[PDB]
Design an enzyme around this catalytic site. Structure first.
Site, PDB file in Angstrom:
ATOM      1  CG  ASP A  37      -3.417  -2.341  -3.475  1.00 46.68           C
ATOM      2  OD1 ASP A  37      -2.262  -2.192  -3.027  1.00 46.68           O
ATOM      3  OD2 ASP A  37      -4.401  -1.752  -2.978  1.00 46.68           O
TER       4      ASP A  37
ATOM      5  CB  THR B 256      -1.242  -2.337  -9.960  1.00 45.86           C
ATOM      6  OG1 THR B 256      -1.936  -1.161 -10.372  1.00 45.86           O
ATOM      7  CG2 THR B 256      -0.049  -2.564 -10.885  1.00 45.86           C
ATOM      8  CG  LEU B 257      -7.217  -1.276  -7.116  1.00 44.94           C
ATOM      9  CD1 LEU B 257      -6.453  -0.916  -5.855  1.00 44.94           C
ATOM     10  CD2 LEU B 257      -8.136  -0.145  -7.521  1.00 44.94           C
TER      11      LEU B 257
ATOM     12  NE  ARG C 174       2.465   4.095   0.863  1.00 44.60           N
ATOM     13  CZ  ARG C 174       1.382   3.844   0.139  1.00 44.60           C
ATOM     14  NH1 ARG C 174       1.175   2.626  -0.347  1.00 44.60           N
ATOM     15  NH2 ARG C 174       0.508   4.816  -0.100  1.00 44.60           N
TER      16      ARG C 174
ATOM     17  CE  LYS D 240      -8.051   2.052   1.069  1.00 43.37           C
ATOM     18  NZ  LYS D 240      -7.721   0.691   0.576  1.00 43.37           N
TER      19      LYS D 240
ATOM     20  NE  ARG E  36      -8.342   1.476  -3.166  1.00 45.10           N
ATOM     21  CZ  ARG E  36      -8.275   0.149  -3.225  1.00 45.10           C
ATOM     22  NH1 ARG E  36      -9.250  -0.543  -3.802  1.00 45.10           N
ATOM     23  NH2 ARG E  36      -7.220  -0.485  -2.724  1.00 45.10           N
ATOM     24  CE1 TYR E  37      -7.746   5.246  -1.437  1.00 47.58           C
ATOM     25  CE2 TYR E  37      -8.511   6.582  -3.292  1.00 47.58           C
ATOM     26  CZ  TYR E  37      -7.648   5.625  -2.771  1.00 47.58           C
ATOM     27  OH  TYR E  37      -6.708   5.027  -3.582  1.00 47.58           O
TER      28      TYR E  37
ATOM     29  CE1 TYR F 140       0.313   3.017 -12.260  1.00 49.47           C
ATOM     30  CE2 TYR F 140      -0.746   4.429 -13.889  1.00 49.47           C
ATOM     31  CZ  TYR F 140       0.379   4.060 -13.170  1.00 49.47           C
ATOM     32  OH  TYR F 140       1.573   4.721 -13.362  1.00 49.47           O
TER      33      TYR F 140
HETATM   34 MG   LIG Z   1      -0.689  -1.928  -1.379  1.00 49.83          MG
HETATM   35 MG   LIG Z   2      -3.336   3.589   0.971  1.00 52.25          MG
HETATM   36 MG   LIG Z   3      -4.085  -1.025  -0.817  1.00 50.95          MG
END
Ligand SMILES: [Mg+2]
Ligand SMILES: [Mg+2]
Ligand SMILES: [Mg+2]
Lengths: 354, 354
Positions: free
Chosen positions: B100, B96-97, B182, B232, B304-305, B93
């Site tokens: 991302d 992926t980030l 999404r 964010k 991050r958020y 993950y």
């Molecule tokens: Mg994304």
């Molecule tokens: Mg999001």
């Molecule tokens: Mg994203």
């Protein structure tokens, strides 16, 4: 639920056809036959090879029937692609249709799926062995982006068939299950992306329209088939887990309400298709336009759906819908009703024995 | 963009947290720290290897921050899996980030994707080269069915990142685009299926519950993140194309209506999660129960958020929502607020230079 909702079905079907502007096209009967025969001929020779004849477990008669149905689907809907493209796509979509006949638990053959893939070894499952070996013949017609879509959708389809082996329509209250499964087995992105051969379209120049068509065509495509199949499936006690039937089980609503839900989604999807692509690149609207019409024609002309039974029942009725239906149906037949003896020959089995 | 609906943000967030009765007790302060450090340590050593340091183009500070955010996500939500599983999942993950938030064009490296895959040659795109080389470390924890789900979802994710490079929110009137995208980038099936290690669950005995959890958790999961992380992403350029914002563009509705749509889907998804799994296998409900709570806990805490900022602006307001929000936000910090110096060390960069 005793009787079939014939009047409701006719109304929805007429609306569907009017929303998409079902109408005559430059796609004749002579061209139809040419394409049908070309696609069938190359595919039949392929499925008749000893390797295919041996790793693909399918009753000869159904393989024959499935191939004929698929060639018809591709030829009638992918009206703008080359003959080679129709042929190679016919082979791939025939592979997908056939896999629905395997009761074989994918489990044992999927245990080493990733390691074999990463190492470059042939897959254990015979379906995958033939499909992946043939795939390049299909992918050569597309750019990298579209190719990725075909690859993913085929992988999804495999899992869908796996899930369907459990004859599970979803736990009551599991509202997200129905469409979850329908997308898995729908081949939406494969169909949607395969509409754009690089020979005719530039993947990068039309990235946005192509991506959008994939997204919208995914649902239109599957729901239209769910509806057009609603007549043949109605009393099919064998066919137990269709989108409509899983709506009943998962959402706990009447078969009728499930059918209301399906037609609303279908009609709405149809409107938005037009609303979005009418004013866009004319060549793109052409392919989208031709797929929708050919796809419906295919459902209308193919015995499989038995829609002729509905035509034979309202043939003389003087109702508004009944007449609009019969006219559309006659238009369809006018160009889509074709005797198999005019293109589907010789049979696969005869080429296999040769 | 213009002005953040802080007020409305409070209301929607309070409604979700309240409906799901947000409460985390997955770990004792001590178990949290143990797992965080174990996961971080193995991942940090992995990303510090010269091969990884070389093919993975990421600013060192960003890699460090992303790794810490992911370890927190995995540890806090996959509360029932082994330490090794958390560690390997954290690595995947994190890959992926790192993509991302990235800005790359895949086209040139995806031209020979299938042929290279089928031949067993390393992929041209460096991300794929590292991810596929590492994948087996993740897949060894799962049975064939779940493994297939992780593989597909990662393939989808890649296409999602590709599509997002065009900063396209969909053509006005293209209602099916938003959720289409999404799901592409959501990693729903990867997350959902990775909740069932074969060490603790029998894939065949719980095929129906697992498939169902994948289907329902796909949406719950992505929508919850869309709601919690609306803040964010609101002004971030790379995130301007999100679910909520694409609803505005594609459906032609107010940012507010898009928000109302998102919270309704979220609340409803939450309701059905409980309705379906409450009475099913207790071990399954446990994992589902622990993921939902840990996942929310994670959102109210990870950097991050930036939900701390929204807290440092309403901690005074006498609005009821700002009050219910802060009680939740402090509850989350109390259990999951952990100083990085207690587990995230030494830094990846320090191990890379060694
Ligand atoms: Mg994304
Ligand atoms: Mg999001
Ligand atoms: Mg994203």
């Amino acid at each position: 639920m005793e009787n079939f909702p014939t009047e409701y079905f006719l109304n929805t079907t007429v609306r569907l056809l009017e929303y998409i502007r079902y109408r005559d096209s430059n796609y004749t009967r002579e061209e139809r036959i040419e394409n049908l025969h070309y696609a069938y001929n190359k595919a039949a020779h392929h499925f008749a090879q000893p390797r295919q004849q041996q790793l693909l477990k399918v009753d000869p008669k159904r393989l024959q029937a499935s191939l004929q149905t698929i060639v018809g689907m591709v030829v009638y809907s992918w009206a703008k692609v080359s003959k080679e493209c129709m042929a190679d796509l016919s082979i791939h979509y025939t592979y997908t249709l056939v896999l629905d006949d395997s009761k074989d638990d994918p489990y044992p053959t999927m245990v080493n799926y990733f390691d074999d893939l990463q190492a470059g070894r042939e897959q254990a499952h015979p379906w995958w062995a033939l499909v992946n070996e043939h795939f390049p013949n299909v992918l050569r017609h597309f750019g990298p982006f579209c190719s990725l879509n075909l690859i993913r959708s085929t992988l999804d389809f495999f899992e869908g068939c796996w899930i369907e082996q459990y004859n599970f329509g979803g736990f009551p209250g599991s509202h997200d299950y129905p469409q979850f499964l329908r997308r898995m087995n729908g081949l939406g992105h494969c169909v949607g992306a395969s509409l754009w051969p690089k020979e005719q379209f530039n993947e990068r120049s039309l990235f946005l329209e192509i991506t959008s068509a994939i997204a919208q065509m995914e649902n239109w495509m599957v729901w239209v088939n769910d509806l057009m199949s609603f007549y043949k499936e109605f009393d099919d006690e064998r066919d137990q887990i269709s989108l409509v039937k899983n709506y009943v089980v998962s959402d706990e609503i009447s078969l009728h309400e499930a059918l209301e839900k399906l037609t609303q989604d279908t009609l709405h999807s149809s409107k938005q298709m037009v609303a979005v692509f009418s004013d866009k690149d004319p060549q793109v609207m052409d392919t989208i336009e031709c797929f929708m019409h050919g796809y419906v024609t295919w459902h209308l002309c193919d015995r499989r759906y038995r829609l002729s039974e509905i035509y034979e029942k309202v043939k003389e009725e003087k109702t508004e819908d009944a007449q609009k239906f019969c006219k559309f149906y006659e238009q369809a037949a006018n160009v889509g009703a074709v005797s198999p003896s005019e293109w589907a020959y010789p049979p696969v089995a005869q080429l296999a024995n040769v």
